[PDB]
A paper describes a structure:
The crystal structure of a YkfC ortholog from Bacillus cereus (BcYkfC) at 1.8 Å resolution revealed that it contains two N-terminal bacterial SH3 (SH3b) domains in addition to the C-terminal catalytic NlpC/P60 domain that is ubiquitous in the very large family of cell-wall-related cysteine peptidases. NlpC/P60 is a large family of cell-wall related cysteine peptidases that are broadly distributed in bacteria, viruses, archaea and eukaryotes. Characterized NlpC/P60 enzymes are almost all γ-d-Glu-DAP (or γ-d-Glu-Lys) endopeptidases. The first SH3b domain plays an important role in defining substrate specificity by contributing to the formation of the active site, such that only murein peptides with a free N-terminal alanine are allowed.
Numbering used by the authors: 29 to 333
The structure:
């Protein structure tokens, strides 16, 4: 059955009940994802990848299909994150307490919405008995209720009403009606995140992995590409090295480009690329001709019409 993400961003696990104590702030409702990421050492971040712990992250209001339940954990398919693993959505395990269902929100899912357009922004719940607020990610979509000279009012997945400053968001009729981006729009979007530390499976303005970054940049501009780097590398139109253009996605694969794809970056022209590269680093711009990367070059895809 149908449910909605009830936290700024939910982290989905490859198995239920796999949290360390340091991961607790990712699993509560509400979350504290700055506490989560900023508290971790490098080794603690790398464990997420090397012990194969995470699947993806889903944002506030994103719809999921609940498919299994083990204790306090549910297995869900995240709609809007394409993967060859499952035709309905991206699979993984998350705490049930991070999901909600409100009929009014469910009915308004196909109405015009506000898309959050800064890396993160503050939503103010109004009315709220305890004057609550929520820091939300870039690419969060909530149904638009009303607009004044300074703000948009929106509906939260739990049925509460909230507002954000107009400068923190944009409204659109639907995903399908987000205008087609120019390559520079995509680049400018990526640039907003320069210096944001990497996290495995990161799919929000609280931290990205390389494919979560590319998926999020495209999705926020109306183009849904696969969640993961391997599938990203086999969708869109194949581009040859001599024909690289701004916005093109560039892929790197193990064994000198011959094996599995494990990195993706976006070409930004003049020989440079932007990416969220690895746990040791942050969203950054580097040359395509960087040692390591250049030997693993495994092709390029174009997603812009």
């Amino acid at each position: 059955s149908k449910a909605f993400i009830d936290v700024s961003a939910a982290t989905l696990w490859t198995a239920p009940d796999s949290l360390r104590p340091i991961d607790v702030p990712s699993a509560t409702n509400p979350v504290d994802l700055w506490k989560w990421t900023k508290s971790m050492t490098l080794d603690e971040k790398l464990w997420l990848t090397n012990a194969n712990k995470l699947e993806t992250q889903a944002l506030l209001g994103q719809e999921v299909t609940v498919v299994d339940k083990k204790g306090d954990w549910v297995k869900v398919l995240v709609h809007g994150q394409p993967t060859p693993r499952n035709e309905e959505g991206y699979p993984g395990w998350m705490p049930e307490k991070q999901l909600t269902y409100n009929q009014e929100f469910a009915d308004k899912t196909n109405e015009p919405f506000v898309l959050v357009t800064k890396p993160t922004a503050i939503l103010y719940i109004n009315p709220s008995e305890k004057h609550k607020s929520l820091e939300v990610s870039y690419n969060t979509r909530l149904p638009l209720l009303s607009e004044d000279t300074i703000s948009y009012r929106v509906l939260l997945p739990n049925g509460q009403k909230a507002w954000l400053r107009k400068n923190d968001g944009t409204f659109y009729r639907s995903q399908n009606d987000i205008p087609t981006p120019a390559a520079d729009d995509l680049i400018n979007t990526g640039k907003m995140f320069l210096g944001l530390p990497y996290i495995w499976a990161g799919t929000s303005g609280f931290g990205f992995d390389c494919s979560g970054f590319t998926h999020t940049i495209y999705k926020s501009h109306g183009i849904t590409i696969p969640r993961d780097s391997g599938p990203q590398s086999r969708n869109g139109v194949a581009v040859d090295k001599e024909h690289l253009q701004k916005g093109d996605l560039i892929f790197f694969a193990h064994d000198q480009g011959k094996g599995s794809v494990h990195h993706v970056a976006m070409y930004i022209g003049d020989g440079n690329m932007i990416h969220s590269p690895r746990a040791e680093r942050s969203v950054e711009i580097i040359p395509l001709n960087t040692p390591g990367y250049i030997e693993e070059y495994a092709g390029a895809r174009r997603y812009l019409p």
